[PDB]
Enzyme design. Structure first.
Site, PDB file in Angstrom:
ATOM      1  N   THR A  41       0.825  -1.206   0.000  1.00 44.65           N
ATOM      2  CA  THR A  41       0.000   0.000   0.000  1.00 44.65           C
ATOM      3  C   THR A  41       0.860   1.256   0.000  1.00 44.65           C
ATOM      4  OG1 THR A  41      -1.626   1.272   1.303  1.00 44.65           O
ATOM      5  CG2 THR A  41      -0.126  -0.149   2.508  1.00 44.65           C
ATOM      6  N   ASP A  42       0.301   2.335  -0.564  1.00 41.63           N
ATOM      7  CA  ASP A  42       0.975   3.631  -0.524  1.00 41.63           C
ATOM      8  C   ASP A  42       1.111   4.181   0.894  1.00 41.63           C
ATOM      9  OD1 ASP A  42      -1.736   4.249  -0.070  1.00 41.63           O
ATOM     10  OD2 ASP A  42      -1.941   5.583  -1.790  1.00 41.63           O
ATOM     11  N   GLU A  43       0.355   3.648   1.857  1.00 41.54           N
ATOM     12  CA  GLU A  43       0.307   4.254   3.183  1.00 41.54           C
ATOM     13  C   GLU A  43       1.612   4.071   3.936  1.00 41.54           C
ATOM     14  OE1 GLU A  43      -3.387   3.422   5.216  1.00 41.54           O
ATOM     15  OE2 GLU A  43      -4.494   3.513   3.313  1.00 41.54           O
ATOM     16  N   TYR A 100      -1.786   0.131  11.021  1.00 45.76           N
ATOM     17  CA  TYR A 100      -1.942  -0.610   9.771  1.00 45.76           C
ATOM     18  C   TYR A 100      -0.775  -0.366   8.828  1.00 45.76           C
ATOM     19  CZ  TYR A 100      -3.441  -1.369   4.894  1.00 45.76           C
ATOM     20  OH  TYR A 100      -3.509  -1.775   3.571  1.00 45.76           O
ATOM     21  N   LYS A 142       1.949  -3.118   7.438  1.00 47.94           N
ATOM     22  CA  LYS A 142       2.241  -3.345   6.025  1.00 47.94           C
ATOM     23  C   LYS A 142       3.714  -3.083   5.712  1.00 47.94           C
ATOM     24  CE  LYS A 142       0.042  -4.522   3.202  1.00 47.94           C
ATOM     25  NZ  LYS A 142      -0.267  -5.920   2.732  1.00 47.94           N
TER      26      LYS A 142
HETATM   27  N1  NAD Z   1      -8.403  -2.111  -0.093  1.00 45.42           N
HETATM   28  C1  NAD Z   1      -7.434  -1.083  -0.503  1.00 45.42           C
HETATM   29  O1  NAD Z   1      -7.777   0.023  -0.769  1.00 45.42           O
HETATM   30  C2  NAD Z   1      -5.934  -1.468  -0.597  1.00 45.42           C
HETATM   31  C3  NAD Z   1      -5.065  -0.540  -1.109  1.00 45.42           C
HETATM   32  C4  NAD Z   1      -3.714  -0.886  -1.190  1.00 45.42           C
HETATM   33  C5  NAD Z   1      -3.328  -2.181  -0.769  1.00 45.42           C
HETATM   34  N2  NAD Z   1      -4.184  -3.050  -0.264  1.00 45.42           N
HETATM   35  C6  NAD Z   1      -3.666  -4.381   0.112  1.00 45.42           C
HETATM   36  O2  NAD Z   1      -4.243  -5.250  -0.678  1.00 45.42           O
HETATM   37  C7  NAD Z   1      -4.441  -6.640   0.186  1.00 45.42           C
HETATM   38  C8  NAD Z   1      -5.893  -7.052   0.037  1.00 45.42           C
HETATM   39  O3  NAD Z   1      -6.698  -5.939   0.453  1.00 45.42           O
HETATM   40  P1  NAD Z   1      -8.321  -6.132   0.517  1.00 45.42           P
HETATM   41  O4  NAD Z   1      -8.999  -4.740   0.453  1.00 45.42           O
HETATM   42  O5  NAD Z   1      -8.790  -7.102  -0.488  1.00 45.42           O
HETATM   43  O6  NAD Z   1      -8.494  -6.724   2.048  1.00 45.42           O
HETATM   44  P2  NAD Z   1      -9.820  -7.328   2.716  1.00 45.42           P
HETATM   45  O7  NAD Z   1      -9.876  -6.737   4.103  1.00 45.42           O
HETATM   46  O8  NAD Z   1     -11.029  -7.116   1.819  1.00 45.42           O
HETATM   47  O9  NAD Z   1      -9.552  -8.944   2.768  1.00 45.42           O
HETATM   48  C9  NAD Z   1      -8.461  -9.451   3.529  1.00 45.42           C
HETATM   49  C10 NAD Z   1      -8.444 -10.981   3.293  1.00 45.42           C
HETATM   50  O10 NAD Z   1      -7.411 -11.477   3.923  1.00 45.42           O
HETATM   51  C11 NAD Z   1      -7.941 -12.741   4.712  1.00 45.42           C
HETATM   52  N3  NAD Z   1      -6.957 -12.884   5.797  1.00 45.42           N
HETATM   53  C12 NAD Z   1      -6.708 -12.004   6.775  1.00 45.42           C
HETATM   54  N4  NAD Z   1      -5.749 -12.484   7.576  1.00 45.42           N
HETATM   55  C13 NAD Z   1      -5.378 -13.704   7.094  1.00 45.42           C
HETATM   56  C14 NAD Z   1      -4.436 -14.675   7.492  1.00 45.42           C
HETATM   57  N5  NAD Z   1      -3.609 -14.464   8.678  1.00 45.42           N
HETATM   58  N6  NAD Z   1      -4.330 -15.788   6.776  1.00 45.42           N
HETATM   59  C15 NAD Z   1      -5.089 -15.971   5.701  1.00 45.42           C
HETATM   60  N7  NAD Z   1      -5.995 -15.077   5.268  1.00 45.42           N
HETATM   61  C16 NAD Z   1      -6.142 -13.941   5.948  1.00 45.42           C
HETATM   62  C17 NAD Z   1      -9.155 -12.326   5.099  1.00 45.42           C
HETATM   63  O11 NAD Z   1     -10.064 -13.447   5.566  1.00 45.42           O
HETATM   64  C18 NAD Z   1      -9.737 -11.642   3.873  1.00 45.42           C
HETATM   65  O12 NAD Z   1     -10.341 -12.464   2.953  1.00 45.42           O
HETATM   66  C19 NAD Z   1      -4.056  -6.372   1.402  1.00 45.42           C
HETATM   67  O13 NAD Z   1      -2.611  -6.743   1.561  1.00 45.42           O
HETATM   68  C20 NAD Z   1      -4.051  -4.816   1.565  1.00 45.42           C
HETATM   69  O14 NAD Z   1      -3.160  -4.411   2.472  1.00 45.42           O
HETATM   70  C21 NAD Z   1      -5.466  -2.760  -0.176  1.00 45.42           C
HETATM   71  C1  TYD Z   2     -14.488   4.534   6.533  1.00 48.71           C
HETATM   72  C2  TYD Z   2     -14.414   6.034   6.446  1.00 48.71           C
HETATM   73  C3  TYD Z   2     -13.371   6.688   5.907  1.00 48.71           C
HETATM   74  N1  TYD Z   2     -13.295   8.061   5.826  1.00 48.71           N
HETATM   75  C4  TYD Z   2     -12.131   8.711   5.196  1.00 48.71           C
HETATM   76  C5  TYD Z   2     -10.795   8.318   5.800  1.00 48.71           C
HETATM   77  C6  TYD Z   2      -9.848   8.403   4.609  1.00 48.71           C
HETATM   78  O1  TYD Z   2      -9.377   9.734   4.404  1.00 48.71           O
HETATM   79  C7  TYD Z   2     -10.739   7.986   3.442  1.00 48.71           C
HETATM   80  C8  TYD Z   2     -10.649   6.525   3.085  1.00 48.71           C
HETATM   81  O2  TYD Z   2     -10.700   5.759   4.311  1.00 48.71           O
HETATM   82  P1  TYD Z   2     -10.730   4.179   4.300  1.00 48.71           P
HETATM   83  O3  TYD Z   2     -11.813   3.632   3.375  1.00 48.71           O
HETATM   84  O4  TYD Z   2     -10.807   3.696   5.702  1.00 48.71           O
HETATM   85  O5  TYD Z   2      -9.300   3.907   3.677  1.00 48.71           O
HETATM   86  P2  TYD Z   2      -7.774   4.293   3.962  1.00 48.71           P
HETATM   87  O6  TYD Z   2      -7.587   4.593   5.416  1.00 48.71           O
HETATM   88  O7  TYD Z   2      -6.982   3.052   3.495  1.00 48.71           O
HETATM   89  O8  TYD Z   2      -7.507   5.532   3.085  1.00 48.71           O
HETATM   90  O9  TYD Z   2     -12.093   8.294   3.842  1.00 48.71           O
HETATM   91  C9  TYD Z   2     -14.316   8.866   6.297  1.00 48.71           C
HETATM   92  O10 TYD Z   2     -14.288  10.089   6.237  1.00 48.71           O
HETATM   93  N2  TYD Z   2     -15.375   8.185   6.843  1.00 48.71           N
HETATM   94  C10 TYD Z   2     -15.511   6.815   6.970  1.00 48.71           C
HETATM   95  O11 TYD Z   2     -16.518   6.340   7.485  1.00 48.71           O
END
Ligand code: NAD
Ligand code: TYD
Ligand code: NAD
Lengths: 329, 330
Positions: A131-133, A155, A159
């Protein structure tokens, strides 16, 4: 023999949002040169895992309900896979602020466990999805792959620790692992705790949406399908030990995002509640993805189109999200 | 410091190890002005590297608890009432991390999350996370300032860096009053003899061979453990929440030069030096700038030649302490 005459792809976290999208696209044949793939999904089915996300592809998917921290299980299941992708993680910043123990366990120890098992099993291509974070916050301009790690939330620090141990395996053992880092994803099957599906599902029920703080925080949005195409570019053309950015293509303040969401569902600003800010809230993320674009990646989903598709998806999938909204409420 | 009780109460995780036990012994002895009569709690899981003999001279001033920094339940009951928490607890041998890094990530990352979270709930006012120069990678020329990017290469270094990152995220998310120190290679009395200086001393004193890996041109900056501990105490007294503080080494040596110094210090011969192929996880050069902490009053007191000589004399006189350790290591 743990491999046949088609590719074998192992997807940890494949029952979640992004991982299940990758699996559905791979099985559907969306990635050229990966036809008739056998797919193993390993997923521990946390609150975020959902087998409904894979219900249409069970003829190609072997599902293993287990944890990436389970080194004995990985040693048994990994052999014979051509590619490993790690989507498994705890991913909600607000949960990490409440309790980060599982974030460090899954997002760091689980990466050690998976990388070590990949080393022993000789998996030839490994992708650690990140992630970019991990870079903190940037007021103006964009981060390239050389930007220093400076995570602010638990978080993001978890990561980052995962990326660091994966890169240490690459550098110490020659482990063929590549790191991807991406902006905020949106799209079908996202768990409705993230801002876009939370806002959409609440507006569809005529409920209020909670806008954190002053609403001026900036995120750079990418549709999950483009994220997965970037990941596949890294699978096919990336190099061991390297990091690849996958940038967003809609840089929006949360106020601007809220306007787009309200417009897309015919909602009103009278539904928007100002609420106290998130602790340590990152002000702005921005990536440059020139490096991966030079390997042929290009996003295909304009935000207006992707958001329209995503609104349509949530509008038609109450059966999927209503039980999740009910619990979260 | 305003102690909660009548005397200061200091909590030292990993205080039965090499550096942590030195810190405890100095603190109990009164070496740090303003910190006399302290009550000291030492928490240590007594891994292969922990040794209660390291605390023999301060038995009656220290409460020892055999336990793990990952044991959040234990920490929640032991931490309340302590003015300062210092974390020396870690897996620390690079070659062990190459063989198996699972315990490195458990103790050096998850254990830091555990300790920081317990410190948050217990309200500890000053927390110090002890860390390493290896988190920055390798540097060909010059020295790293505290703004250097984290770029660890070995599993040990990546685990230490992961711990620093979650500690700093607690500082930034909650305002947790944690400070981080980073330092290069230590040496001195009571070092477990897997590390290069006591390994060489104990092997040479028994007339056995010592291993020199690769071309020997790797460079390390050496500091005596007592100077490291005084730097850590400077951070305790003068540092600020969320900040990193370097403690530099004042003898920069190639491993060829180190080998010559060690041979000279014990009377050994290059005939004892077994040349062996390079090993996987050792960086070319570490070097820290500690201008930031020197501006807060830190200054080293032990020059390398004098400290090495003291250390040689100590190992000569304490076969009772290290012979069982050497025997087990083989
Ligand atoms: N959602 C975003 O905006 C975003 C952006 C950048 C990177 N990512 C990265 O992309 C990956 C997937 O993100 P997502 O949004 O699909 O997450 P999500 O929260 O939708 O799903 C996480 C999955 O991981 C499984 N899981 C959690 N812990 C586990 C473990 N110890 N063993 C096996 N399975 C496990 C969970 O059951 C679930 O299905 C993650 O590494 C996240 O950090 C997500
Ligand atoms: C979930 C949530 C996020 N946010 C804001 C926080 C972040 O600036 C943006 C996206 O949040 P989020 O979906 O939690 O993602 P991330 O922390 O990975 O960026 O929206 C709200 O304002 N209200 C909400 O209920
Ligand atoms: N030795 C060096 O050259 C050097 C240089 C810079 C930094 N450091 C750092 O300084 C710290 C102390 O190093 P050292 O040389 O004294 O290490 P050491 O190997 O001599 O001792 C480590 C101590 O930690 C204990 N321990 C290990 N895991 C534990 C756990 N989960 N819970 C409780 N106790 C645990 C061990 O029993 C042992 O007593 C470490 O954080 C290390 O990373 C060391």
């Amino acid at each position: 023999v743990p491999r046949g005459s088609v590719p074998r792809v192992f997807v940890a976290g494949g029952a979640g949002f992004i991982g299940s999208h990758y699996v559905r696209e791979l099985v559907a044949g969306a990635y050229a040169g990966w036809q008739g793939c056998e797919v193993t999904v390993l997923d521990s089915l946390t609150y975020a895992g959902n087998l409904a996300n894979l219900a249409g592809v069970r003829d190609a998917v072997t599902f293993v309900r287990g944890d990436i921290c389970d080194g004995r299980l990985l040693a048994e299941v990994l052999p014979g896979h051509d590619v490993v992708l790690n989507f498994a993680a705890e991913t909600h910043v607000d949960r990490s602020i409440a309790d980060s123990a599982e974030f460090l366990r899954t997002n760091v120890q689980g990466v050690q466990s998976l990388m070590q098992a990949c080393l022993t099993a000789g998996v030839p291509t490994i992708v650690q999805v990140s992630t970019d974070e991990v870079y903190g916050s940037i007021e103006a301009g964009s981060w390239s792959e050389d930007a220093p790690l400076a995570p602010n939330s638990p978080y993001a620090a978890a990561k980052a620790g995962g990326d660091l141990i994966a890169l240490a395996y690459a550098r110490t053992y020659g482990l063929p692992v590549r790191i991807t880092r991406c902006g905020n994803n949106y799209g079908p099957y996202q768990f409705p705790e993230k801002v876009i599906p939370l806002f959409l599902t609440r507006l569809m029920d005529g409920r209020s949406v909670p806008l954190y703080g002053d609403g001026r925080n900036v995120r750079d949005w990418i549709h999950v399908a483009d994220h997965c195409r970037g990941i596949q570019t890294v699978v096919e053309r990336g190099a061991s030990g390297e990091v690849y950015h996958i940038a967003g293509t809609a840089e929006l303040t949360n106020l601007e995002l809220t306007q787009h969401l309200l417009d897309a569902v015919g909602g009103s600003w009278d539904a928007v509640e100002r609420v106290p800010d998130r602790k340590g809230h990152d002000r702005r993320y921005s990536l440059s993805d020139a490096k991966l674009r030079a390997l042929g990646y290009a996003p295909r989903v304009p935000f207006a189109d992707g958001l329209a598709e995503t609104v349509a998806w949530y509008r038609a999938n109450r059966h999927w999200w209503e039980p999740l909204r009910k619990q979260l409420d």
